[PDB]
Amino acid sequence: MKIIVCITGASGVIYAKRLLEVLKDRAEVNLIISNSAKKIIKEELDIDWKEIKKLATDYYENDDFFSPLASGSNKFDAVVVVPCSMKTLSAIANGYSANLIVRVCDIALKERRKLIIMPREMPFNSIHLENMLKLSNLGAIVMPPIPAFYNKPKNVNDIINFVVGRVLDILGIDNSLFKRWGT
Amino acid sequence: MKIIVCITGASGVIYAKRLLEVLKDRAEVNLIISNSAKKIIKEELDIDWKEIKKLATDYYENDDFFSPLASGSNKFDAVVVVPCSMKTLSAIANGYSANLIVRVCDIALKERRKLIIMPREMPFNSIHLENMLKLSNLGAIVMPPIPAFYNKPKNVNDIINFVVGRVLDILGIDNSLFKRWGT
Amino acid sequence: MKIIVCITGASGVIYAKRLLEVLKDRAEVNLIISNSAKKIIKEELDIDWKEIKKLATDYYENDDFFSPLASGSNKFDAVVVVPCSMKTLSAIANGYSANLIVRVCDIALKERRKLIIMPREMPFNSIHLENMLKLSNLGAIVMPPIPAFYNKPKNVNDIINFVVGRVLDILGIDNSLFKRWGT
Amino acid sequence: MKIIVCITGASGVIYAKRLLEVLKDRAEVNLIISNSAKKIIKEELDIDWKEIKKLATDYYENDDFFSPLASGSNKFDAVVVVPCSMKTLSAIANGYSANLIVRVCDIALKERRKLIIMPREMPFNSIHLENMLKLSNLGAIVMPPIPAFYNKPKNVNDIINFVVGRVLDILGIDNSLFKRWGT
Amino acid sequence: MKIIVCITGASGVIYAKRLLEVLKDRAEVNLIISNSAKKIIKEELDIDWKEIKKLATDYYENDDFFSPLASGSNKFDAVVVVPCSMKTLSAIANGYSANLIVRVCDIALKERRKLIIMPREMPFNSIHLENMLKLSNLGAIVMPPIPAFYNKPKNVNDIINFVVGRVLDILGIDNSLFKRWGT
Amino acid sequence: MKIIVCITGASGVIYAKRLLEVLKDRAEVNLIISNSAKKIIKEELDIDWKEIKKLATDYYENDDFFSPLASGSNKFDAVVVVPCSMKTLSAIANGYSANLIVRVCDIALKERRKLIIMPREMPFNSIHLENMLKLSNLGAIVMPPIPAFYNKPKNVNDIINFVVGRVLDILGIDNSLFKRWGT
Amino acid sequence: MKIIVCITGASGVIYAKRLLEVLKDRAEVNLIISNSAKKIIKEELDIDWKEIKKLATDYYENDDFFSPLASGSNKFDAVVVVPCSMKTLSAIANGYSANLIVRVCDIALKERRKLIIMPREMPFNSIHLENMLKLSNLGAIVMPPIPAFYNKPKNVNDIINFVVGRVLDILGIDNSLFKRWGT
Amino acid sequence: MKIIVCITGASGVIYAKRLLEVLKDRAEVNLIISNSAKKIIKEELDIDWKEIKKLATDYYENDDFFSPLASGSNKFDAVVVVPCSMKTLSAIANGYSANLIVRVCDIALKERRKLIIMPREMPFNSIHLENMLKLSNLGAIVMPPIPAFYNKPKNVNDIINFVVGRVLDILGIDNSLFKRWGT
Amino acid sequence: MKIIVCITGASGVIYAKRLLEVLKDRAEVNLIISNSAKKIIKEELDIDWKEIKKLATDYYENDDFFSPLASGSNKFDAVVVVPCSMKTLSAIANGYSANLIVRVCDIALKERRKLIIMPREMPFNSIHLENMLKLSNLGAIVMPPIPAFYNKPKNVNDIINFVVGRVLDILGIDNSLFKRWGT
Ligand SMILES: Cc1cc2nc3c(=O)[nH]c(=O)nc-3n(C[C@H](O)[C@H](O)[C@H](O)COP(=O)(O)O)c2cc1C
Ligand SMILES: Cc1cc2nc3c(=O)[nH]c(=O)nc-3n(C[C@H](O)[C@H](O)[C@H](O)COP(=O)(O)O)c2cc1C
Ligand SMILES: Cc1cc2nc3c(=O)[nH]c(=O)nc-3n(C[C@H](O)[C@H](O)[C@H](O)COP(=O)(O)O)c2cc1C
Ligand SMILES: Cc1cc2nc3c(=O)[nH]c(=O)nc-3n(C[C@H](O)[C@H](O)[C@H](O)COP(=O)(O)O)c2cc1C
Ligand SMILES: Cc1cc2nc3c(=O)[nH]c(=O)nc-3n(C[C@H](O)[C@H](O)[C@H](O)COP(=O)(O)O)c2cc1C
Ligand SMILES: Cc1cc2nc3c(=O)[nH]c(=O)nc-3n(C[C@H](O)[C@H](O)[C@H](O)COP(=O)(O)O)c2cc1C
Ligand SMILES: Cc1cc2nc3c(=O)[nH]c(=O)nc-3n(C[C@H](O)[C@H](O)[C@H](O)COP(=O)(O)O)c2cc1C
Ligand SMILES: Cc1cc2nc3c(=O)[nH]c(=O)nc-3n(C[C@H](O)[C@H](O)[C@H](O)COP(=O)(O)O)c2cc1C
Ligand SMILES: Cc1cc2nc3c(=O)[nH]c(=O)nc-3n(C[C@H](O)[C@H](O)[C@H](O)COP(=O)(O)O)c2cc1C
């Protein structure tokens, strides 16, 4: 399974870090990190962004349009935008593929490949909601990171693993990352 | 400030508990708890629902339409639906005021009083998103509990206090519940 | 009163200069100037852009996302985009917060803070008009600089002071910058 | 070139006066002045409205439906509504041809003749914007008088000549009324 | 508090009379009465319309566009159209400010001032309902005079005072004009 | 059968004259003639408008809102607007009942009585077509006078009788005014 | 000027006959006649359809897709569908180019050439009106044959010449076929 | 894999010929050729249409509704309409299953089977674009034959093989028909 | 004839090269090449981008907003975006004039000058199709490079000359670049 993981400049890049490590030995992972996300990884995770780069089977710069990912002639199974900034949510919904992340999302939509986006914002305004609705109407899986608590998390890590486990659920990847509802 | 806190049957009732206690001595709080939320409080917080009832200046049953809240002739400043189930999100968006919670939301909209809803679901489908968009277009503040991490939470409690602090921000209530972006 | 003044690359930056000086001692003013507007200030006002920078209580670069303004956790009262380019009008209407100006407009909309935009173009096409209509429908005050003449302006300065006085009117700031209709 | 100039009751009738005199010897000009505009000409230009009447090759009263203009069987090249009141903008957008001005605009639309409207209002509300969008979508040129300043106006007259020069530009009439962008 | 009371030609002008007298010493009231409403006041209240004129701090004729109210440069707090004819409901919804009443409603919408309309008709058709929906979507308070009976009215006067008390409620004016729901 | 015949200022008032005389002894006919139609009757039929007035069982001035027709409490079976000007088509579609004709059309729609309109214009623009579509969607019978020729008309009179016969067909009135398709 | 005249199966083919003869020596006319129109020409004009065929510079069968007209690579100035059946109005509006007539209309729309349609039906339903509105919105000239009477027609021929003269007006062809409004 | 290949009357039937031969020994292919496409195969490929018929595992006439394909009770995996005429694009988008091709497309949509359409036209008008948008919104893969050149085609054959290879890509059929982007 | 040729980063820049050379001595050509297109010219045409620069009467950098083209006060006859990337298609449709190419397209739309766009993508998704539909609805000529084969191309060059000949057709430029349908 070939999964494109796209990190954009919004709070909660810890979700992307955890997803990348639970995917390490279970899927071919291509990684793209926007310039804004590089600064957020540094600020929120107190590690340099290149530390995230090594958890993927391949990495491409967000401005490297000569990447093989930038064409529908090349194939992949799924895209995960985690977290998804409001800027990138807008670009995906309107087709403004000015970087590699939005280009591979636009490719996923035209080639009918699975597209998961995790918009992180609070509150949402009507522009965010309409951009999400449009993409959901086109078959994208709109999945803002909204933890539940029926698994009774004991720490931050339990919350992160719930969100990531649900992402793997949507990807069709079996996991036991969280205590499910039936316990 | 008179605030109506409405707890519906969705995961994350811990947000409602924390909001009620930080509001205890700062606002007149009226509380409504749906039957489904009573079971979720018991399951997720391992306390009986009547323990939540005592944190409010007033309580009304979700089926008590003779409550003073059930009429626009009586006044309040804000409604907070936390967490907001998809069922109640649907009812508010379509005006199906079959219980007291949806009735006071419908009152808030016709009387132009502040309405905050916190829909808790993951992923969202297009029905959820359109119901949220409609309500946001009418002036409701659509605020799913989506924690950020730039405050670097050290525990579950730091995550809950971020979400609740943002709710107080929207209510216009000064608080220091979380480390803000400028630190 | 904390007002964010955003200057974008469209003709009529003299409006922004006049607004900044009548606001100098009456409000806490944060200023953002886009790169395009820096060139227009130089071309139309024959002064370097840093001369405008000093009229504000604070300045932030349009690419400084680490500015405190870039988060809803921090507070302000109003945003004024003067003048508003068609590019920035598009970005605000579609949520493409790729710079600090659009990000604080998007924040204003989600946090329900006052947003004033002054699109400067002639003629308008249907894309401009639909972008303005959408934002007006969301509660933004869409205010292209369209001077009136019932005050009988004697010079360019009287025209600029009419437009700026109307902006202060919308902000709720008492002023006598122009001869009102009742004279 | 036969141009219908329609003056309605909104501020800025000086634009109509200047347009009429630069058109004097370059086009066959038919003029209509609404009753409200007659009062505004008097108040803003301190001249009687009949002084404007003499600058046209023909004049018709706004209630003279027996005018030849009131039928599509008769021909013209363009209509200019300057300035355009919000009332007349509404009437044109909804087809309420209760006077000669709106009737010749409705004729222009059905006969596919050029229609220019210059709505003068500040701010615009959503009703104005939707009425303009509808007309722009039908091929009308929606042109609120929004002066630019890259020509560095030295006086009110330079501002008026910029707006009027742009109107002549849209009409296809060569002019040197303003210093263009390339200088 | 400066309130514009606008009486249009629909049945139920008794509501406007009662509102004007309960507002007499509690707000600065400007009054406009349409020609049709003058005849309805005479027919339904068996008093000459000038008897209503004296209950206001100021009066303006519906055709007096030189009134200070006819410009956004002048300020007011709220407009109440009571009762609102279907003709005037249409004009407000479509922006056809052909008289002073609709002009001050259009001003209220562009200046974001409170607008209350009380359309009186039975039944409503789809044109009425869409005109009301549009205005409600723009933030107007659409308030047809629909008395309730939980206050157990003993006479016509109790019904009129309920409707008027609710109008004062929306205006933010404290009153005891009716027995509220909580009794 | 009580039929309201409304003549508005558009070409083809001969249709209204012929309809009124074929209805003379077969239905109770109430007649309203707009001021514009009075001039068109004079110009196109070379007879004074009062000659048309005598063919009806009752006549009311277009500004006589005290007419019994102006209330839904009074009853009628059908309204025929023949011919229908574009101005009146607009007013009916938008609910702008500023005269008795549009008021009785609006009454017909709310009371669910039969409404026939015969818009006379050529070509139609998109505003006309949308106004007709809206009214047709509400159940009005939109019937521009478009003669057919399968009856092989020998003179103008045969064309007028075809159009009028079709109107009687829609009214449910048996007639032999034209040679039907089956001959 | 190269004009495509398309006759479809609706009443009023006399309009097409008259248009073809007034165009004989003033434009290059290509003619297409549908099978249904061939029967209507015979029934309504009591002449064989081949009599109409000779009035054109070229004729093509409605099923001859190898005609040069059937490609946008070949050029023409205008299409006139007279009369336009409801079936063909539907096909044009929905793009169902199953014959040569609809194909050249679809070509006219993609190549931005003038398209005139004359739908003949009475009354219209909402399907007709929406099909006309869509085409008018795309720039087609929607022109049902609706004669006026201000020219005071003395016979059927005067009515036919009014309609045809208006068609030539829209085509930009000078004519004196009817007494215009200014007489 | 059972694939229905449908050839309609538009230029570029060479794409259908090439697709049929690369599919010969890799899938069960059912073929339908419209009458118009039979003429285009003859004109553009200078071979009789029956030469194309032999490349399929089964053939059915476009009017043979007794074909097993004409019912959803029978199964297939994918439909490819190559090339897709504007007429057939319209019929599919509107559900006008008047032949076997459109019927199996309508079946594919109701049974949720893969539907690929390749509309061939240049330019497109708004009717084409809306018909494509509607079908794309329903899950059809809208794929006009638009060759790329990053594979550096050396001849017409390289262009045809790129388009066909992309079709096989969408079908999930591995192929090396073109030099992919990563070379 | 002044034509703006805009090359954006999509496959098929050979179309732009061929169009520029057939336009060399027949029109005043202004050229803009985006940074992405510069790389694609190098990769697909194996020539440096400056080789394309010399075929135009003028060249401007895509970031040179001080170019005379960047203002509506300066005039041109037509814009051709060939090829049009999905990113630039999005920007034009939404008005995001962040570079000179989109700015001159936005100018073309407001000044009602001819705009031709040639989006190159396969397949299209619903975002592409809606962006094209919107622009086509505004009067842009949406012309993806979709070659036909009725001219029986013998080589790649014949395909390129068909597409370019059709572009000249839309521009109103006589050419014999391809064998037309009538041969
Ligand atoms: C510390 C920080 C946190 C941010 N958090 C968010 C966020 O949570 N949601 C959001 O939409 N934007 C957020 N932003 C702003 C975005 O980073 C900004 O819009 C940026 O342009 C996104 O670009 P990208 O999608 O290419 O990463 C944040 C910015 C900073 C500096
Ligand atoms: C343990 C549990 C957790 C649930 N969590 C959610 C949830 O997170 N979001 C949601 O929409 N519904 C959730 N539901 C289902 C809702 O409770 C259900 O739709 C209910 O009818 C809501 O009614 P109420 O809004 O009146 O409380 C949950 C149900 C259970 C038993
Ligand atoms: C001298 C000059 C004047 C301009 N005037 C306008 C204008 O009046 N309206 C507009 O929409 N764009 C105008 N532009 C183009 C914008 O500056 C351009 O779209 C830019 O990208 C806007 O970016 P910004 O909003 O970040 O400032 C002008 C450009 C120049 C060089
Ligand atoms: C002094 C004065 C200035 C006005 N200015 C405007 C204006 O700038 N914009 C506007 O929409 N209406 C304005 N109005 C109100 C309009 O004149 C009013 O709506 C009138 O009915 C327009 O009618 P008309 O379009 O037939 O001229 C103004 C009125 C007055 C008395
Ligand atoms: C006695 C009487 C009662 C009326 N009642 C109503 C009414 O209740 N609702 C309504 O929409 N129109 C009613 N009308 C008709 C309106 O007065 C008419 O449409 C008028 O043009 C409204 O104009 P205005 O809004 O400027 O007052 C009534 C008319 C009369 C004579
Ligand atoms: C001689 C003459 C003929 C007219 N013919 C038409 C017409 O055929 N269609 C139309 O919409 N307006 C026509 N008009 C204009 C209308 O009369 C005008 O819009 C008027 O305001 C209609 O008002 P009413 O509907 O109250 O009669 C004509 C005007 C004149 C003077
Ligand atoms: C005598 C006769 C008259 C007709 N008149 C009309 C008409 O006036 N309007 C219409 O829409 N259809 C009319 N029809 C039906 C159309 O001819 C029918 O829908 C036909 O399929 C149109 O096909 P065409 O557009 O290819 O000519 C008439 C049919 C007949 C036999
Ligand atoms: C030589 C020729 C080429 C054609 N090319 C096209 C084309 O490229 N696109 C199109 O929409 N129609 C084209 N047509 C017209 C269609 O064949 C026509 O609309 C036909 O009815 C389609 O029917 P079908 O889809 O059942 O094959 C062409 C016609 C001919 C004769
Ligand atoms: C080799 C190559 C080929 C590309 N082909 C296309 C294409 O055919 N269609 C498309 O939409 N984008 C294509 N792209 C991606 C665009 O270049 C990218 O979205 C870019 O940002 C467009 O920017 P521009 O419009 O300013 O040139 C291609 C990229 C590369 C590297």
Coordinates of C-alpha atoms in Angstrom, one line a residue, chain I residues 20-133:
Chain I
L20 CA 3.6 32.0 -31.4
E21 CA 5.3 31.3 -34.7
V22 CA 2.1 31.3 -36.8
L23 CA 1.2 34.7 -35.1
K24 CA 4.7 36.2 -35.6
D25 CA 3.9 38.4 -38.6
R26 CA 0.1 38.6 -38.2
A27 CA -0.4 40.2 -34.7
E28 CA 1.2 42.2 -32.0
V29 CA 2.0 39.4 -29.5
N30 CA 2.8 39.9 -25.8
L31 CA 4.2 36.9 -24.1
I32 CA 4.3 35.8 -20.4
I33 CA 5.8 32.5 -19.3
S34 CA 5.4 31.2 -15.7
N35 CA 8.3 29.8 -13.8
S36 CA 6.8 26.3 -14.0
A37 CA 6.3 26.6 -17.8
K38 CA 10.0 27.6 -18.2
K39 CA 11.0 24.2 -16.7
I40 CA 8.4 22.4 -18.9
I41 CA 9.6 24.1 -22.1
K42 CA 13.1 22.9 -21.2
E43 CA 11.9 19.3 -20.4
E44 CA 9.5 18.8 -23.3
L45 CA 11.0 20.9 -26.1
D46 CA 14.7 20.4 -25.1
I47 CA 15.3 24.1 -25.7
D48 CA 15.9 26.8 -23.2
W49 CA 12.8 29.0 -22.5
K50 CA 14.5 32.1 -23.7
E51 CA 14.2 30.6 -27.2
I52 CA 10.5 31.0 -26.9
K53 CA 10.9 34.5 -25.6
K54 CA 12.2 35.8 -28.9
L55 CA 9.0 34.9 -30.9
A56 CA 7.0 37.7 -29.3
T57 CA 6.8 41.4 -29.9
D58 CA 7.1 41.9 -26.1
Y59 CA 7.8 39.8 -23.1
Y60 CA 7.1 40.3 -19.4
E61 CA 8.0 38.3 -16.3
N62 CA 5.1 36.6 -14.5
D63 CA 6.0 38.6 -11.4
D64 CA 6.4 42.0 -13.1
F65 CA 3.2 43.7 -11.9
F66 CA 4.7 47.1 -13.1
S67 CA 4.1 45.8 -16.6
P68 CA 1.7 47.9 -18.6
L69 CA -0.5 44.8 -19.1
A70 CA -1.3 44.8 -15.4
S71 CA -3.8 47.6 -15.7
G72 CA -7.2 47.9 -17.5
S73 CA -6.3 51.4 -18.5
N74 CA -4.1 49.8 -21.1
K75 CA -5.7 47.9 -23.9
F76 CA -5.4 44.5 -25.7
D77 CA -7.7 42.4 -27.9
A78 CA -7.4 38.8 -26.7
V79 CA -5.7 36.6 -24.1
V80 CA -4.7 33.0 -24.8
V81 CA -3.6 30.8 -21.9
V82 CA -1.9 27.8 -23.7
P83 CA -1.5 25.4 -22.1
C84 CA -3.6 26.2 -19.0
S85 CA -2.5 24.4 -15.8
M86 CA -5.1 23.3 -13.3
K87 CA -3.6 25.7 -10.8
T88 CA -4.0 28.6 -13.2
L89 CA -7.5 27.5 -14.2
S90 CA -8.4 27.6 -10.5
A91 CA -6.8 31.0 -10.0
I92 CA -8.6 32.5 -13.0
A93 CA -12.0 31.0 -12.0
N94 CA -11.6 32.4 -8.4
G95 CA -9.9 35.7 -9.3
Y96 CA -6.7 35.0 -7.4
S97 CA -4.5 37.3 -9.6
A98 CA -1.3 36.6 -7.7
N99 CA 0.8 36.8 -10.9
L100 CA 0.7 38.8 -14.2
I101 CA -1.0 35.9 -16.2
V102 CA -4.1 35.7 -13.9
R103 CA -4.1 39.5 -13.6
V104 CA -4.5 40.0 -17.3
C105 CA -7.1 37.3 -17.5
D106 CA -9.0 39.1 -14.7
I107 CA -8.6 42.3 -16.6
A108 CA -9.9 40.6 -19.8
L109 CA -13.0 39.6 -17.9
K110 CA -13.8 43.0 -16.4
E111 CA -13.0 44.9 -19.6
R112 CA -14.9 42.3 -21.7
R113 CA -12.0 41.4 -23.9
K114 CA -11.7 37.9 -25.4
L115 CA -10.2 35.3 -23.1
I116 CA -9.2 31.8 -24.4
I117 CA -8.0 29.1 -22.0
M118 CA -6.7 25.7 -23.0
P119 CA -6.7 23.5 -19.8
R120 CA -4.5 20.4 -20.3
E121 CA -5.4 17.5 -17.9
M122 CA -6.7 14.0 -18.2
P123 CA -8.9 13.0 -16.6
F124 CA -10.7 16.1 -15.3
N125 CA -12.2 16.0 -11.8
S126 CA -15.3 18.0 -10.7
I127 CA -13.2 20.9 -9.5
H128 CA -11.6 21.4 -13.0
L129 CA -15.0 21.0 -14.6
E130 CA -16.7 23.6 -12.3
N131 CA -13.9 26.0 -12.8
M132 CA -14.2 25.7 -16.5
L133 CA -18.0 26.0 -16.4

